[PDB]
């Protein structure tokens, strides 16, 4: 197989400054900050994840795994890793996505989100995923929470916590134990712990559903442990109010039991692409026409990661 010649950049801790906390939990702490490479007269808005405060050899292993994947991907619809910093704790440094995750975004902006935006996100997520598929990579955790918003017009896939690189000989991926997001995964993933690109397509379907319902919890109520039987019955997520049958049919096709029957990311690009040419024909949102969506501080040597190569 092809040698992976990605560069892993190591960053001095003096080169960046953590300006405010963004979040906290099982993963650690994510800060927003600025990265100023030395003598370069450029200032790059970044997100920085350090591991809580601890050093668990089974956790350091996991952030370094994530670094590995992120360093191996270069695409406008996939999040960019800027580098790692090897201090007390291993720090992951990425491009700041100022509008946060897309689940939270649609929740907060339902009244302002038009069909053009929804369909575009669909194209963009599909484009990222298709790229990942080209790079033989299975994401395994696609959800609206794991898509970040750089601008309302521009989203990127994140969270390579669970991503696995398939061998040129490998067709699926057998996983082990592990906590998993049940409501987003294909039937095979629940029954056999098989994961393919086509299992990601299923997750893509659920992600589209999240967007179209402005951020509903899939199978709200239904406890995790009985989802497998529900799906084998033939039951699926309901048609969201705003969705034409044309759109809902794409979601449904992502949720076929036979994985080869599901759409390919490349196809999804085409389909949504066509729909985003005439959005009002495909999504019915009241007040669609009169809907608009949206500089920080300090100095003006500021350059987005996308323009720092
Ligand atoms: C959905 C929650 C969220 O993401 N909230 C959020 C996010 C961000 N921006 C941002 N930019 C980059 C990254 C990122 O790639 O971080 C890597 C891991 C270094 C993240 C981010 C990634 N994870 C896993 C997070 C968990 C929690 C918080 C952030 C991240 N996030 C901003 O930047 C302005 C704000 C933001 N807000 C404050 C939370 C949403 N509330 C408004 C509801």
Q: Could you give a quick summary of the protein structure above?
A:
This protein is of the alpha+beta class and 309 residues long.
Fold and architecture overview:
This protein has helices at residues 57-70, 102-109, 115-134, 187-191, 197-212, 227-233, 245-253, 265-275, and strands spanning 16-24, 29-35, 44-50, 81-86, 90-95, 137-138, 147-151, 154-157, 164-165, 173-174, 194-195. The protein is globular and about 60 Å long. The chain has a domain at 100-281: Transferase(Phosphotransferase) domain 1 (Transferase(Phosphotransferase), domain 1, Orthogonal Bundle). With 309 residues, it is α+β, with helices and mostly antiparallel strands. The protein is built from eight helices and eleven strands. A hairpin with an 8-residue loop joins strand 2 and strand 3 (44-50). The strands form four sheets. Strands 1-2-3-5-4 form a five-stranded antiparallel sheet, covered by helices on one side. The longest helix is centred in the middle third of the chain and has 20 residues, at 115-134. Bound molecules: the ligand *CCC(=O)Nc1cc(Nc2ncc(C(=O)OC(C)C)c(-c3cn(C)c4ccccc34)n2)c(OC)cc1N(C)CCN(C)C.
